[PDB]
Design a protein around this ligand. Sequence first.
Ligand SMILES: Nc1ncnc2c1ncn2[C@@H]1O[C@H](COP(=O)(O)OP(=O)(O)OC[C@H]2O[C@H](O)[C@H](O)[C@@H]2O)[C@@H](O)[C@H]1O
Ligand SMILES: Nc1ncnc2c1ncn2[C@@H]1O[C@H](COP(=O)(O)OP(=O)(O)OC[C@H]2O[C@H](O)[C@H](O)[C@@H]2O)[C@@H](O)[C@H]1O
Ligand SMILES: [Mn+2]
Ligand SMILES: [Mn+2]
Ligand SMILES: [Mn+2]
Ligand SMILES: [Mn+2]
Lengths: 157, 157
Amino acid sequence: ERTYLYRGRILNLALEGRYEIVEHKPAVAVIALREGRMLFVRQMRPAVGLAPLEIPAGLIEPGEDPLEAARRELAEETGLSGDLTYLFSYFVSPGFTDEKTHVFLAENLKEVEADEDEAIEVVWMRPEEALERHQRGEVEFSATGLVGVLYYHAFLR
Amino acid sequence: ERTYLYRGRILNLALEGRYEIVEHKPAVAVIALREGRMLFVRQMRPAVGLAPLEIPAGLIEPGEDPLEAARRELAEETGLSGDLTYLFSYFVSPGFTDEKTHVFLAENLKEVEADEDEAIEVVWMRPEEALERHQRGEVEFSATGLVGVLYYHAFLR
Ligand SMILES: Nc1ncnc2c1ncn2[C@@H]1O[C@H](COP(=O)(O)OP(=O)(O)OC[C@H]2O[C@H](O)[C@H](O)[C@@H]2O)[C@@H](O)[C@H]1O
Ligand SMILES: Nc1ncnc2c1ncn2[C@@H]1O[C@H](COP(=O)(O)OP(=O)(O)OC[C@H]2O[C@H](O)[C@H](O)[C@@H]2O)[C@@H](O)[C@H]1O
Ligand SMILES: [Mn+2]
Ligand SMILES: [Mn+2]
Ligand SMILES: [Mn+2]
Ligand SMILES: [Mn+2]
């Protein structure tokens, strides 16, 4: 039996007995490799006060399914389209939120727009270099960035 | 300038201008391999209404640093100790929360207690089989479970 303390724009806060639960829209993320570089993005994230290394990601909007949201996010954040394949999903932090992320691979990328959402920085970077910069403390990862780097090292070399 | 709407036990909800922000304690997670099996755990997670495949994980308590929290969580959840090495960290979902997870590798595991926290199920499973069960829809992953599986395939085979 959830009791709602806050109903917001991209989350709700509820109590369920002693549990504090954040309801959140599902998300998508896209792993894309070109010429040995992975497609990362960075943007200021007020929750953390910095810009972590992420892969293109977004929330699924009403009416959309994960594949469609992934296509849209990739185009809006980086100006690209590609051939998308579903990989796997994960709960970001199931001890307190129901946010679920669906991860896709993109191949054969083409520019469909001149990126285009300006507050997001497109960062093509070899995943080996992203991992080294992180190990040396020079950049933070989001879960989606780390998943992209680890998936590359597992399956795309 | 954060304005607090809710101060809780393991999270705070704040507004910062138009942003909804969940402050949350940092976490740790431990990747451990023995005889080709990875150490997973499962427990009911009221936020998601199911028991995803996770690796042993917990919140850092007052006074502790990540390594110490990792040692404690591994012992409390699975009854084991091992030689711990820091791997990397990630923000679970930096579009709305500051929760950061520090991930460790454990080697040379030994039983120090007869597991011991009973509401957590210890699930030794080959990571190849965890990935196959997930692909067939039979189990959900947390981020920590997925990170463990991908790290194994990248670096531990
Ligand atoms: N939503 C909640 N609200 C209130 N208290 C909680 C909640 N969940 C657990 N507790 C209490 O807090 C104690 C927490 O148990 P520990 O093992 O240190 O942490 P973890 O495994 O939950 O979370 C570790 C990470 O794994 C997941 O990804 C999480 O989202 C975290 O990112 C519990 O025993 C309960 O008493
Ligand atoms: N905390 C917030 N509160 C209010 N509105 C927000 C917030 N953050 C962004 N917006 C608004 O909502 C729109 C969201 O932009 P989209 O690209 O679909 O999602 P994403 O990249 O943020 O999140 C994708 C995932 O990546 C991260 O891991 C996240 O935590 C998610 O798990 C914004 O343009 C803002 O207008
Ligand atoms: Mn985005
Ligand atoms: Mn977007
Ligand atoms: Mn735990
Ligand atoms: Mn615990």
